[PDB]
Amino acid sequence: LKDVVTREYTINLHKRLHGVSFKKRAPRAVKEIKKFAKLHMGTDDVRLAPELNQAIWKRGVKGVEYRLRLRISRKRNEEEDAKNPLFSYVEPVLVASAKGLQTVVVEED
Amino acid sequence: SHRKYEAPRHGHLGFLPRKRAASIRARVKAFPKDDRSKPVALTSFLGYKAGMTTIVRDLDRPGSKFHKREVVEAVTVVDTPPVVVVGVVGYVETPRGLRSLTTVWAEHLSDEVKRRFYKNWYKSKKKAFTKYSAKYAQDGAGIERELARIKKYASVVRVLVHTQIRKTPLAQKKAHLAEIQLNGGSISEKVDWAREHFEKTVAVDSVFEQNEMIDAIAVTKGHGFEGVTHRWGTKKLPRKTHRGLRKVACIGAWHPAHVMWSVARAGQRGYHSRTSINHKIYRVGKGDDEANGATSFDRTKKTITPMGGFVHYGEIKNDFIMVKGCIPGNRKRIVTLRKSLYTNTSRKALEEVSLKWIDTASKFGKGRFQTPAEKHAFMGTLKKDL
RNA sequence: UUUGCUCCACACAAUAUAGAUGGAUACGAAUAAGGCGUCCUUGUGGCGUCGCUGAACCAUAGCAGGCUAGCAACGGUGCACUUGGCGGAAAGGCCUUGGGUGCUUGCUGGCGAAUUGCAAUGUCAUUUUGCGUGGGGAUAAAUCAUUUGUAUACGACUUAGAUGUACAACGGGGUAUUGUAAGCAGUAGAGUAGCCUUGGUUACGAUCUGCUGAGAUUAAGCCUUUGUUGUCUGAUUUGU
RNA sequence: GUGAACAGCCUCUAGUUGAUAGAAUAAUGUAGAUAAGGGAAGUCGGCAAAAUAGAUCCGUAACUUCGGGAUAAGGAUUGGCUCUAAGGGUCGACGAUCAACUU
RNA sequence: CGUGGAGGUCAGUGACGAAGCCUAGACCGUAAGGUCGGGUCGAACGGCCUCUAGUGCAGAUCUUGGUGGUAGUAGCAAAUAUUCAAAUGAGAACUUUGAAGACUGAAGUGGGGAAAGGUUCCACGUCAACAGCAGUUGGACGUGGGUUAGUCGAUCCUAAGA
RNA sequence: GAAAUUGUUGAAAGGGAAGGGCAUUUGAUCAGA
Ligand SMILES: [Mg+2]
Ligand SMILES: [Mg+2]
Ligand SMILES: [Mg+2]
Ligand SMILES: [Mg+2]
Ligand SMILES: [Mg+2]
Ligand SMILES: [Mg+2]
Ligand SMILES: [Mg+2]
Ligand SMILES: [Mg+2]
Ligand SMILES: [Mg+2]
Ligand SMILES: [Mg+2]
Ligand SMILES: [Mg+2]
Ligand SMILES: [Mg+2]
Ligand SMILES: [Mg+2]
Ligand SMILES: [Mg+2]
Ligand SMILES: [Mg+2]
Ligand SMILES: [Mg+2]
Ligand SMILES: [Mg+2]
Ligand SMILES: [Mg+2]
Ligand SMILES: [Mg+2]
Ligand SMILES: [Mg+2]
Ligand SMILES: [Mg+2]
Ligand SMILES: [Mg+2]
Ligand SMILES: [Mg+2]
Ligand SMILES: [Mg+2]
Ligand SMILES: [Mg+2]
Ligand SMILES: [Mg+2]
Ligand SMILES: [Mg+2]
Ligand SMILES: [Mg+2]
Ligand SMILES: [Mg+2]
Ligand SMILES: [Mg+2]
Ligand SMILES: [Mg+2]
Ligand SMILES: [Mg+2]
Ligand SMILES: [Mg+2]
Ligand SMILES: [Mg+2]
Ligand SMILES: [Mg+2]
Ligand SMILES: [Mg+2]
Ligand SMILES: [Mg+2]
Ligand SMILES: [Mg+2]
Ligand SMILES: [Mg+2]
């Protein structure tokens, strides 16, 4: 939990957005994805790829996909302050279907 | 001036205050009157409300329009694995009421009941009862001395029992510990029964029998803060009402210059302790008994568990008590079932019920099939499987 | 735990006192009846006696009670032990065994006291706390934070979490909802418009049929899990 | 574009993305809705809400100032697709060619 | 008894500290009040005999000014809606850029004008105050630049009228 | 550089107001001889 690692996960955005107000569904999905990455990688500093934001907002504010396949990379950052020297960076995986996929270690990048 | 039209008051003033119960396990405030000629037996049992189903039975009620005819009745299933006896408490009578004189615990206590003494179990050193267990060092002289005190005193004897919550599908993992009065006299042999049952389980079939009328003591389902309209059943104000209509219009006369306790006010609804009486046991089902939900007329080898499991509860793998009707509390909640405090002979009690069929269709929807085999027989072969 | 906690003994400090200044000295019941003693044939018995208040009983003499010499008798009393029993209504007290030891004013002596100056409470009790010196004993939790939803406005409540029948995220299965997905194919299709091997073929064609009770969703407060991946010592506080 | 339409709804050019925010989802509210069976029994009073609604065809009473009432009342139909028919211009009874919708 | 001012007097007090103010510190008077000590302070002031008055406050929904409890409370909820990354910066929900999602939907949230405003236009610097959160941004603050006519208007004509 | 009002420190008290009168206890403080 103290080194760099990249894994691909499926997030069930449907059950996290269940009953959420329509005007808040996509922002809530963004926050739920940040919470998901924090839970899995132990990093408070979660950064979302703009392509991932595009994938979240692809079908409008309330048309968030039920499942999103994400690549999360826990990488180390060096800046003015340490401030959680490890951070997670989340990307979309761009698969045809986000169903029936398990968590996998990418192990190469 | 007078009310100008009579109506009964809204709500029952004997169930005040409508506050949250102090504990999730409702207290047994009265045990059955002791009959000291009977054998020593428990007067109550601890279980977990699993859910409701429906049954069909032949009504035996001469003079009724439905005598010797089939009736469909709602029933509640309480999962009741055997409870483990881990202690005995002695109660002496005093001019100031009953008073516990001493409690004698079992030598070994399982982690299930040990968790009950810990707010943070995972990070504790689990020291509970570690020095007490040494009272059983060679001959248990201190334990025998305390039991002798209980025999020499303590006109009322209660055992400490705890649930085997690990046998339920609940995630709680922390057992419920309660005092159950021992009826069946000779306080000496009450204590002897408790000591001989130390660390041993007591099955629900040794306490309750088929057709017996029992009482359910449980904390009702909580609903948070509630307005007067649903909390008390007061009349909704007309549509024209400014400042809201889900209210009580007059909360009091000018004098007394105070809101009176008897006026309906908005507040907490539910999560109250309730002791509802006269629920007939329709089944005393056994956990190891496959075809639990089967009857002498059905014979379908099926358990009491509805298809897909009890909604929000899980599967019944232990002994269960099926009572007629409904009982206070929601699914997964600890409920204490106690013997009736009086002898009911109204021909509603003393009726011997024989179940003809037990619904095991899914409660997760409009269930159509009792068993997966019946679903296969009706539907034929599907593409995925079957 | 910048040597922590508790108990005991002692010393020293504080701290106050709803108010010590010989002893709260134990049947029960009745009162137009009883207590005590005694006797017998043991009773709702006989006999005697008592009350008319505790104005009693016990205790009570000694530099706030010293130091010593005896006599008499194995008594009284305190102390610390010790044998055992009884007492649970708030028992925390009552009774009892044995020896040791101090006093004894039961009786007879010797020594001392003064000047606190003619009185000044003239300080003698117990309530907690702290500290130091020795001895004895033990070696946890709670809360915040995270989590659960049997709970909930917020507090609160109910759960879980230091290596496991653990938990979580996915995945699988069950359950349930809807109603037959996309794609492909078709001697299906009301037909219209072209071509010729005039029994076919080309273009368009709502829709229909088969793969297909398929496809999609399914806990967000459904059930379950021989799978995959990961998580599991951060903060604060609490002592008789 | 739909549509009779400068209606409502969606879009192009142009412009804006400005209203203090975050977390939960109690009561009571404000606004929007649904509701078994009954159908104004509520209430001063059908207040509020619901029901009706466009277009085509049929049919339309009392009364009347003969103009109306009248959309009286009361009924039927409406999608998609493939066709059919009718309704024209120009050039020299027809031929050639061109063209747009309405029924 | 006390206050502002006046005549006389104590050759009164005082920068070695007047007046004022603070002071569960002391003294005197039944009291109005008077006196003293200590602290603060800095330029005038007092006792007595008289004179004089714009001379004594708890109030008047008194006047002016200042300040509370309420109270970190009511609330900052109409106009569909924001999100991701980068840059800048001490600091970014609000600035800029890019990407995305939306809206006004031509009777516009578009492009110009009349009345009115008067520099709000634009650039640079810049955030103490204002923008009822914020702010690096602004119709803010500071410094400057900018409005070019024979043909567009006024000017000329007459209208109701003056 | 007053008061209202406020912060900190110190002291004290506080079972549904507070404040006051007579009297004394206790604590603090102090004049006179
Ligand atoms: Mg909802
Ligand atoms: Mg009446
Ligand atoms: Mg009800
Ligand atoms: Mg009104
Ligand atoms: Mg159901
Ligand atoms: Mg048109
Ligand atoms: Mg209805
Ligand atoms: Mg209906
Ligand atoms: Mg009707
Ligand atoms: Mg009516
Ligand atoms: Mg009526
Ligand atoms: Mg009427
Ligand atoms: Mg109306
Ligand atoms: Mg009509
Ligand atoms: Mg009419
Ligand atoms: Mg003057
Ligand atoms: Mg001075
Ligand atoms: Mg003062
Ligand atoms: Mg000066
Ligand atoms: Mg005046
Ligand atoms: Mg005044
Ligand atoms: Mg006055
Ligand atoms: Mg005033
Ligand atoms: Mg004022
Ligand atoms: Mg507020
Ligand atoms: Mg508002
Ligand atoms: Mg708005
Ligand atoms: Mg904003
Ligand atoms: Mg932008
Ligand atoms: Mg609109
Ligand atoms: Mg639009
Ligand atoms: Mg500008
Ligand atoms: Mg502001
Ligand atoms: Mg600011
Ligand atoms: Mg400027
Ligand atoms: Mg001109
Ligand atoms: Mg100054
Ligand atoms: Mg002040
Ligand atoms: Mg109070």
Curated annotation (Swiss-Prot), chain A:
Note: There are 2 genes for eL31 in yeast.
MF annotations from Gene Ontology: structural constituent of ribosome
CDD domains, per the entry: Ribosomal_L31e
Protein name as it appears in the record: Large ribosomal subunit protein eL31A
PROSITE patterns per the UniProt record, alphabetical: RIBOSOMAL_L31E
Physiological role: Component of the ribosome, a large ribonucleoprotein complex responsible for the synthesis of proteins in the cell. The small ribosomal subunit (SSU) binds messenger RNAs (mRNAs) and translates the encoded message by selecting cognate aminoacyl-transfer RNA (tRNA) molecules. The large subunit (LSU) contains the ribosomal catalytic site termed the peptidyl transferase center (PTC), which catalyzes the formation of peptide bonds, thereby polymerizing the amino acids delivered by tRNAs into a polypeptide chain.
Protein family membership: Belongs to the eukaryotic ribosomal protein eL31 family.
Biological process according to GO: cytoplasmic translation; regulation of translational fidelity
Keyword terms of this UniProt record: Cytoplasm, Ribonucleoprotein, Ribosomal protein
Broad class of where this protein is predominantly found: cytoplasm
GO CC annotation terms, alphabetical: cytosol; cytosolic large ribosomal subunit
Curated annotation (Swiss-Prot), chain B:
Family annotation (InterPro entries): L3_arc_euk, Ribosomal_L3_dom_3_arc_sf, Ribosomal_uL3, Ribosomal_uL3_CS, Transl_B-barrel_sf
GO molecular function: RNA binding; structural constituent of ribosome
Gene Ontology biological process terms from the UniProt entry: cytoplasmic translation; maintenance of translational fidelity; ribosomal large subunit assembly; rRNA processing; translation; translational elongation
PROSITE patterns membership: RIBOSOMAL_L3
Compartments it resides in: Cytoplasm
SUPFAM superfamilies: Translation proteins (SSF50447)
Positions carrying Phosphothreonine: 102
Glycyl lysine isopeptide (Lys-Gly) (interchain with G-Cter in ubiquitin) crosslink site(s): 38, 135
Keyword terms of this UniProt record: Cytoplasm, Isopeptide bond, Methylation, Phosphoprotein, Ribonucleoprotein, Ribosomal protein, Ubl conjugation
GO cellular component terms, semicolon-separated: cytoplasm; cytosol; cytosolic large ribosomal subunit
Knockout mutant characteristics: A mutant confers resistance to trichodermin, a trichotecene toxin produced by plant-pathogenic fungi.
Domain of life the protein comes from: Eukaryota
UniProt similarity note: Belongs to the universal ribosomal protein uL3 family.
Note from the entry: Present with 450 molecules/cell in log phase SD medium.
Functional description taken from the UniProt entry: Component of the ribosome, a large ribonucleoprotein complex responsible for the synthesis of proteins in the cell. The small ribosomal subunit (SSU) binds messenger RNAs (mRNAs) and translates the encoded message by selecting cognate aminoacyl-transfer RNA (tRNA) molecules. The large subunit (LSU) contains the ribosomal catalytic site termed the peptidyl transferase center (PTC), which catalyzes the formation of peptide bonds, thereby polymerizing the amino acids delivered by tRNAs into a polypeptide chain.
Official protein name in the record: Large ribosomal subunit protein uL3
Gene designation per UniProt: RPL3
